[PDB]
Amino acid sequence: SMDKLKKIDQTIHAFYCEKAVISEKLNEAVLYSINAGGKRIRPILFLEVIEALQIPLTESHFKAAAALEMIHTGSLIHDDLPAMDNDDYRRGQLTNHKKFDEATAILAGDSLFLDAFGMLAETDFPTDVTVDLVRSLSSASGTFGMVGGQMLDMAAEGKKLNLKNLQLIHRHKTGQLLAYPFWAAARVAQLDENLLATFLEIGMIIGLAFQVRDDILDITAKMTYPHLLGLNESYQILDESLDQAEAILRKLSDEIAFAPQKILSLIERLRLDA
């Protein structure tokens, strides 16, 4: 009903504006990175799986979605730093450290990480649900998730590596937090164990597809699919990953009260053509 993008941004603004401000500059810097566009694929997938499962959307679903986006946004800020990829622009816009300075951007990223779990604990979900969501969000973001993947992507700089090493980087650097929204929606829906596993499986496939798509675009728009396998095979892997994800979603819809059309449409907009 209400535009999900607008509501997600309003949820985020409300978190920063509802409490007595301590540092105006910190709030400003954090919101700069939030308001600097973003397709919001991660929170949108969470919300769309919730609706697909016939659950009416509430304030709390938007907060859980927002928590996820805050972690994603924080990782981008740090990834751009001079000590990291040292980029002056993300999406044709000044990166945080260039808009402000290096110390501000390090702290803005730290805030988004730490704040996200506060956003997530503000929901009205049953408390056992919230605890699992926190555990899994940490697992997907930290030393055994996104941060680990970031370290391996650095550790990788040194070498040609095989498929196994490329998949290891992607799985953790990006795969985990693209899969989280699928698993998390299913957990909020209180689905049984094997359904949770299926939803996580979809998410990992979509995470893979998203990273292969990235690699293909970044050379039509080092340690990548096109470099490792060539373009032809990269296109093939993207296409069969999306097919595979779509087939599992359709099979669920033939088995439980699940209406994934909007998800299937979102996935269809990721496709690339020769």
Enumerate the known binding-site residues for Mg(2+).
Answer: 79, 85, 153, 214, 218
d(CA 17, CA 11): 10
85 lines the binding site for Mg ion (CB under 5 A)? yes
17 lines the binding site for a copy of itself (CB under 8 A)? no
Read off φ and ψ for residue 169, nearest 5 degrees. Answer: -60, -55
Of residues 27 and 253, the one with the C-beta less far from a copy of itself: 27
SS3 159: coil
Q: What is the CA radius of gyration of the chain?
A: 18
Extract the tokens encoding 138: 């940490």
SS3 94: strand
Q: Segment contacting a copy of itself (CB under 8 A): 41-49, 97-105, 158-166, 199-207?
A: 97-105
The answer to whether 271 and 241 have CB atoms below 8 angstroms apart is: no
Instruction: Map residues 92-111 to x or -, x wherever contact with ligand IPE holds by CB under 6 A.
Output: --------------------
The answer to whether 209 and 242 have CB atoms below 8 angstroms apart is: yes
Out of 39, 83, 92, 164, the only residue in the binding site for ligand IPE (CB under 6 A) is 39
Extract the tokens encoding 160: 């040609």
38 lines the binding site for ligand IPE (CB under 6 A)? yes
Extract the tokens encoding 102: 């290096």
**Integer angstrom CA distances of residue 72 from 21, 39, 75, 91, 178:** 23, 12, 5, 15, 10
Of residues 45 and 202, the one with the C-beta less far from ligand IPE: 45
Q: Which positions ≥6 away from 162 have C-beta within 8 Å?
A: 228
Instruction: Map residues 213-232 to x or -, x wherever contact with ligand IPE holds by CB under 6 A.
Output: -x---x--------------
Q: Segment contacting a copy of itself (CB under 8 A): 48-56, 102-110, 201-209, 215-223?
A: 102-110
91 lines the binding site for ligand IPE (CB under 6 A)? yes
SS3 22: coil
Q: Segment contacting ligand IPE (CB under 6 A): 71-79, 106-114, 182-190, 230-238?
A: 71-79
181 binds, among a copy of itself, ligand IPE, Mg ion, none (CB under 5 to 8 A by kind): none
174 binds, among a copy of itself, ligand IPE, Mg ion, none (CB under 5 to 8 A by kind): ligand IPE
39 binds, among Mg ion, a copy of itself, ligand IPE, none (CB under 5 to 8 A by kind): ligand IPE
